[PDB]
Amino acid sequence: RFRGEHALRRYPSGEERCIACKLCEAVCPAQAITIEAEPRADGSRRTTRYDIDMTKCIY
Amino acid sequence: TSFGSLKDEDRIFTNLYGRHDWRLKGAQSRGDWYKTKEILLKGPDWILGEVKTSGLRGRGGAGFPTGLKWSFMNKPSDGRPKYLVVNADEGEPGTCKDREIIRHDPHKLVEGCLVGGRAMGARAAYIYIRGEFYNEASNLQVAIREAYEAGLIGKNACGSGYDFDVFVVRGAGAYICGEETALIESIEGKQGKPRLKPPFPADVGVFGCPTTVANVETVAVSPTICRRGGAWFASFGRERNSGTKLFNISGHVNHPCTVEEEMSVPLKELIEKHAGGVIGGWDNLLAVIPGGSSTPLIPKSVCETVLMDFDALVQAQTGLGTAAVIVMDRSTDIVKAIARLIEFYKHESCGQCTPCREGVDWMNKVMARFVKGDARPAEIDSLWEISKQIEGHTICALGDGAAWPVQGLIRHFRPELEERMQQFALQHQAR
Amino acid sequence: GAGGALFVHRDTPENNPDTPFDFTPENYKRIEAIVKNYPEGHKAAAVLPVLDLAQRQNGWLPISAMNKVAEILQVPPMRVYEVATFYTMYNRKPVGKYHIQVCTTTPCMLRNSDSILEAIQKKLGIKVGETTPDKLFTLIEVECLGACVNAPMVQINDNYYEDLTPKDIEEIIDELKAGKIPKPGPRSGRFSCEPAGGLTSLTEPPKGPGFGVQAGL
Amino acid sequence: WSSTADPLSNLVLTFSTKEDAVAFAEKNGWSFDVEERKVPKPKSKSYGANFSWNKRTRVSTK
Amino acid sequence: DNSTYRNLQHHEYSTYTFLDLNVELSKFRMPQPSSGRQSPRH
Amino acid sequence: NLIEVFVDGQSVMVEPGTTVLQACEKVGMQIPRFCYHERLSVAGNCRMCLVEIEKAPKVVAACAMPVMKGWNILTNSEKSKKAREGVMEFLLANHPLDCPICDQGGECDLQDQSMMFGSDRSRFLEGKRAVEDKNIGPLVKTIMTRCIQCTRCIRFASEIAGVDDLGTTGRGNDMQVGTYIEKMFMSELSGNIIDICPVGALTSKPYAFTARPWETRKTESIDVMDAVGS
Ligand SMILES: Cc1cc2nc3c(=O)[nH]c(=O)nc-3n(C[C@H](O)[C@H](O)[C@H](O)COP(=O)(O)O)c2cc1C
Ligand code: SF4
Ligand code: SF4
Ligand code: SF4
Ligand code: SF4
Ligand code: FES
Ligand code: FES
Ligand SMILES: [Mg+2]
């Protein structure tokens, strides 16, 4: 259960799991997540910018 | 007092079974088209009073006072046409009385349409007949043509100065369009989905005009009541349940048939007399559905002493419905039969409103799992709750009628469901 | 139970807006007779009869036929499509010469209706929703057809064949494929809904006019 | 990222009355522009109008 | 006689029997009422 | 003249022909709704606005039921709450789990009314329904598995835009809203179907996936594209 450095995971097929739903951005107490998204070349709902400020995050 | 053993001299629907000529000459040989001009001269108020005294109730499902409905439509004109719509979309699984009336007593039907139109002050009568009954519709058209040629309908009908038109509208296959407001919508060339009340059809009906929707049997027995009294009709039956009724006995019975009897004949005597009884005897009876798929089922204990009557079946947590008696013997899968009924209601659902649409699909899936036992005993109460959520929250009565058989099955055969679930659990855990 | 038929239209060479369809002059006379059965300003009420007539003439309802009906009645093609997809008696897909429709509801299921369906499937060598290779027979299941007391029964081009047994339905199929038209009605010796054993009612001649006429009436 | 130099960018205050808001703004010294409240006007809804005999309100579908 | 089925006229009907009968009935009809407009879309 | 009705025991004078929903609006109560739009006609099919009258044993559709003289409307009664919970249960039972990938997201009426009037748990143990997506042009993106068959777009299309190319095809649970053919719903008033659709069935294609309702700041301005001054 230890929480340390952040990471973005992938599906076993290699596709990114994130669907640009911004729930993490909405729920972040420190407002350390910045998300900007647009449809991908194949029409998938995927992120273009996903930033985390580790000097602002409270882990 | 006891009821039953109706006499042929008192049976309204003569020429049933089609053993005599159904043409205009054959009908006129019987009492059809007799003193109809005198009835029309007596006029609307007298006919409405006669119907109210006879105490006739609706023969096409829900039992409402036909005199009361026609009095509702007896309001003064406001510059709009007036229509009587005769419902002949006999989509109820078990009902054939309207088919027999149309195919064998078309002139009785036409005379009843004329009398009802005069009573309501209606210019036209649209007989909406279901599309599968092509030969019945053709016979009805032949009878209407004969009536027009003889002058019994049209302008100055029966030489009384009252203009009246009779049209036949053939629908497509839609048990939902059998319903009155859906019937009206289907006549207007639309999809045929039920309307909301208010406005009631007596105020805004087909084409936006005052219309009254009446059943084939009701309109067909109207002129017999007019020619006769209605003290007689009240004498046949109980105090608030008067007249004769057409019962279609079908299922696991020796002689499936359609018969006419009194409105309070006991079910056991009816089955044992007019149909030859259950195939394996009365001790082999399992359940009886007395009013088609819409009404719930009753077990043998209730069927032993019960009268085929509106109030009598209401007190038995059932309804008379269309007096369609489906018999199931001990060697049948009651769960599978009720599941087939629920699947029928799923297919015959207009899909307009959320409770019936989604809930009937949900109940179909639940029953399909139940018939093989792939469920848990805690799901029976869930099915009961969702059936109660469907009932009373829908636009039309199809949603209510799709939950009553489920409620009856859960109420009278819960041990069967639990035993099947236990058997399935034993079978699967053995792997 | 899924219907298996889609409610969307994909243009195909055999079914497209350019598919030729037009009513014959006799059918135009029939249409003009049907239209004036309804009040003026309510021509849209004839959509169902006109669509039924088009289906009777053509054998099924192409999108071009729906468009022609919409043009004739001056109603939106979307409304015509709604009607056609809602009502199940309209064939939006080509069907065989004979459209067998076996009732499979509970009043018919209590009697051996599954036997009738199985006999039909064995006789024709087709499934429950397919068509014979020679485009002669189509087989479907349907709900109650209103002939419950004569169960089991099938409908073949608006003709009821009632009180059927597997042998009877096989004979009917053989007669149909030979070229003849079998006589509709019960096949168990009955003529109508009367009980098979014998008439328990209406055994005496009907009374004539003015039997129990009220005093004043 | 999105930078700013306006301290009062995210400052939104809630008042129960236009008069209260005006008084607060006046006593704090800022300029103010007031927008009158817009409430929807009453509408006559009738389900029976969808099936009119001679009017255009009749619906072609449900 | 009550032993013969008299409804045998229906083993002759064809595809257009109903519509032909409807066409025949057109002569006996009566003028239909009008709404004052050609269509609700007018 | 005005007739007197009662909402939760509070008297209110309403003009004849006023519906239960409008009477509750006058007294300050907003009855939940999915198919009722004040600018469109009355449909009365979503069944979400069912309320209980004090002496009537049957719930009535508030959006379509005119009030009578001396009617007491119990908006927050047990029967009304149970009816709302049942209707919400049906809607969510057939709805798909697409909220994170749905542009409606945090501004969905199904979500808000589920959180305020529906239950917090699901008894649906069966399979859900999947519907083929249509194509009605480069402006409106249709994911019709999320449609709740409320017929707002059909009524809007016909009545407002004068275009009658939308409708319902089929019947039963398989009833689908669409054109039935590959026809583009192209009109000068086409984005309003994006607005009035209570669910994510119809969404803006240019705006797809870009943002979420809680992030955006709203600035009230006027339109300069034409001379109407919208
Ligand atoms: C042939 C027939 C089929 C009917 N089917 C339905 C149905 O599917 N659903 C329903 O709610 N009512 C159904 N009804 C009842 C009608 O809604 C309505 O109550 C009836 O036609 C009125 O006739 P009555 O006054 O003679 O009873 C049916 C009635 C008839 C005659
Ligand atoms: S936006 Fe955040 S919460 Fe949503 S899928 Fe991506 S990482 Fe997960
Ligand atoms: S209860 Fe069912 S059949 Fe009746 S209006 Fe609602 S969806 Fe249609
Ligand atoms: S329409 Fe609403 S409830 Fe449905 S997936 Fe989108 S946000 Fe969720
Ligand atoms: S697409 Fe949207 S507006 Fe149209 S019926 Fe479906 S939920 Fe309603
Ligand atoms: S149940 Fe088969 S004809 Fe009625
Ligand atoms: S808001 Fe009234 S039924 Fe939909
Ligand atoms: Mg939307």
PDB file of N, CA and C in Angstrom, chain A residues 19 21-23 25-26 35 37-39 43-45, chain F residues 99-103 205 208-212 214-215:
ATOM      1  N   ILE A  19      -7.935   7.417 -20.010  1.00  0.00           N
ATOM      2  CA  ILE A  19      -8.966   7.779 -20.969  1.00  0.00           C
ATOM      3  C   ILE A  19      -9.306   9.263 -20.886  1.00  0.00           C
ATOM      4  N   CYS A  21     -10.298  11.251 -18.390  1.00  0.00           N
ATOM      5  CA  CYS A  21     -11.562  11.527 -17.726  1.00  0.00           C
ATOM      6  C   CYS A  21     -11.451  12.596 -16.645  1.00  0.00           C
ATOM      7  N   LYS A  22     -10.233  12.964 -16.243  1.00  0.00           N
ATOM      8  CA  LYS A  22      -9.959  14.099 -15.361  1.00  0.00           C
ATOM      9  C   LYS A  22     -10.532  13.925 -13.957  1.00  0.00           C
ATOM     10  N   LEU A  23     -10.883  12.699 -13.566  1.00  0.00           N
ATOM     11  CA  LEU A  23     -11.321  12.469 -12.192  1.00  0.00           C
ATOM     12  C   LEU A  23     -10.188  12.710 -11.205  1.00  0.00           C
ATOM     13  N   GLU A  25      -7.701  14.789 -11.642  1.00  0.00           N
ATOM     14  CA  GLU A  25      -7.544  16.237 -11.581  1.00  0.00           C
ATOM     15  C   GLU A  25      -8.624  16.870 -10.713  1.00  0.00           C
ATOM     16  N   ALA A  26      -9.855  16.366 -10.805  1.00  0.00           N
ATOM     17  CA  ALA A  26     -10.943  16.930 -10.015  1.00  0.00           C
ATOM     18  C   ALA A  26     -10.789  16.613  -8.534  1.00  0.00           C
ATOM     19  N   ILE A  35      -4.336  18.299 -16.928  1.00  0.00           N
ATOM     20  CA  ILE A  35      -4.691  17.381 -18.001  1.00  0.00           C
ATOM     21  C   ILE A  35      -5.290  18.172 -19.152  1.00  0.00           C
ATOM     22  N   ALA A  37      -6.685  17.122 -23.193  1.00  0.00           N
ATOM     23  CA  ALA A  37      -6.975  15.963 -24.017  1.00  0.00           C
ATOM     24  C   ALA A  37      -7.604  16.390 -25.330  1.00  0.00           C
ATOM     25  N   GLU A  38      -7.489  15.510 -26.317  1.00  0.00           N
ATOM     26  CA  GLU A  38      -8.137  15.680 -27.608  1.00  0.00           C
ATOM     27  C   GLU A  38      -8.243  14.312 -28.261  1.00  0.00           C
ATOM     28  N   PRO A  39      -9.161  14.138 -29.211  1.00  0.00           N
ATOM     29  CA  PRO A  39      -9.261  12.845 -29.897  1.00  0.00           C
ATOM     30  C   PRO A  39      -7.958  12.492 -30.598  1.00  0.00           C
ATOM     31  N   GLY A  43      -9.282   8.369 -33.268  1.00  0.00           N
ATOM     32  CA  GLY A  43     -10.517   8.729 -32.605  1.00  0.00           C
ATOM     33  C   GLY A  43     -10.606   8.360 -31.142  1.00  0.00           C
ATOM     34  N   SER A  44      -9.557   7.783 -30.566  1.00  0.00           N
ATOM     35  CA  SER A  44      -9.582   7.420 -29.158  1.00  0.00           C
ATOM     36  C   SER A  44      -9.542   8.663 -28.277  1.00  0.00           C
ATOM     37  N   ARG A  45     -10.203   8.571 -27.127  1.00  0.00           N
ATOM     38  CA  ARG A  45     -10.180   9.633 -26.126  1.00  0.00           C
ATOM     39  C   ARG A  45      -8.907   9.473 -25.306  1.00  0.00           C
TER      40      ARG A  45
ATOM     41  N   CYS F  99     -19.503   6.561 -18.297  1.00  0.00           N
ATOM     42  CA  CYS F  99     -19.368   7.899 -17.723  1.00  0.00           C
ATOM     43  C   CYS F  99     -17.973   8.491 -17.883  1.00  0.00           C
ATOM     44  N   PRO F 100     -16.876   7.785 -17.582  1.00  0.00           N
ATOM     45  CA  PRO F 100     -15.552   8.411 -17.755  1.00  0.00           C
ATOM     46  C   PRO F 100     -15.212   8.794 -19.189  1.00  0.00           C
ATOM     47  N   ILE F 101     -15.685   8.055 -20.189  1.00  0.00           N
ATOM     48  CA  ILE F 101     -15.378   8.354 -21.584  1.00  0.00           C
ATOM     49  C   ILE F 101     -16.521   9.108 -22.265  1.00  0.00           C
ATOM     50  N   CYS F 102     -17.406   9.721 -21.492  1.00  0.00           N
ATOM     51  CA  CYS F 102     -18.604  10.360 -22.013  1.00  0.00           C
ATOM     52  C   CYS F 102     -18.478  11.867 -21.868  1.00  0.00           C
ATOM     53  N   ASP F 103     -18.712  12.591 -22.964  1.00  0.00           N
ATOM     54  CA  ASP F 103     -18.605  14.043 -22.923  1.00  0.00           C
ATOM     55  C   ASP F 103     -19.644  14.678 -22.014  1.00  0.00           C
ATOM     56  N   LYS F 205     -19.226  17.192 -31.755  1.00  0.00           N
ATOM     57  CA  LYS F 205     -18.051  16.533 -32.309  1.00  0.00           C
ATOM     58  C   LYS F 205     -16.817  17.434 -32.252  1.00  0.00           C
ATOM     59  N   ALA F 208     -15.569  17.381 -28.730  1.00  0.00           N
ATOM     60  CA  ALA F 208     -15.421  16.052 -28.152  1.00  0.00           C
ATOM     61  C   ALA F 208     -14.087  15.901 -27.433  1.00  0.00           C
ATOM     62  N   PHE F 209     -14.154  15.428 -26.189  1.00  0.00           N
ATOM     63  CA  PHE F 209     -13.036  15.003 -25.352  1.00  0.00           C
ATOM     64  C   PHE F 209     -12.156  16.151 -24.875  1.00  0.00           C
ATOM     65  N   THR F 210     -12.459  17.399 -25.233  1.00  0.00           N
ATOM     66  CA  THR F 210     -11.528  18.487 -24.951  1.00  0.00           C
ATOM     67  C   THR F 210     -11.517  18.884 -23.478  1.00  0.00           C
ATOM     68  N   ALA F 211     -12.681  18.971 -22.838  1.00  0.00           N
ATOM     69  CA  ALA F 211     -12.751  19.510 -21.487  1.00  0.00           C
ATOM     70  C   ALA F 211     -13.877  18.835 -20.717  1.00  0.00           C
ATOM     71  N   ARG F 212     -14.049  19.267 -19.471  1.00  0.00           N
ATOM     72  CA  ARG F 212     -15.061  18.787 -18.547  1.00  0.00           C
ATOM     73  C   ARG F 212     -15.814  19.972 -17.964  1.00  0.00           C
ATOM     74  N   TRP F 214     -16.785  20.964 -15.014  1.00  0.00           N
ATOM     75  CA  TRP F 214     -16.373  21.630 -13.783  1.00  0.00           C
ATOM     76  C   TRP F 214     -15.146  22.507 -13.993  1.00  0.00           C
ATOM     77  N   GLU F 215     -14.327  22.203 -15.001  1.00  0.00           N
ATOM     78  CA  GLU F 215     -13.119  22.988 -15.232  1.00  0.00           C
ATOM     79  C   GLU F 215     -13.439  24.342 -15.851  1.00  0.00           C
TER      80      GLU F 215
END
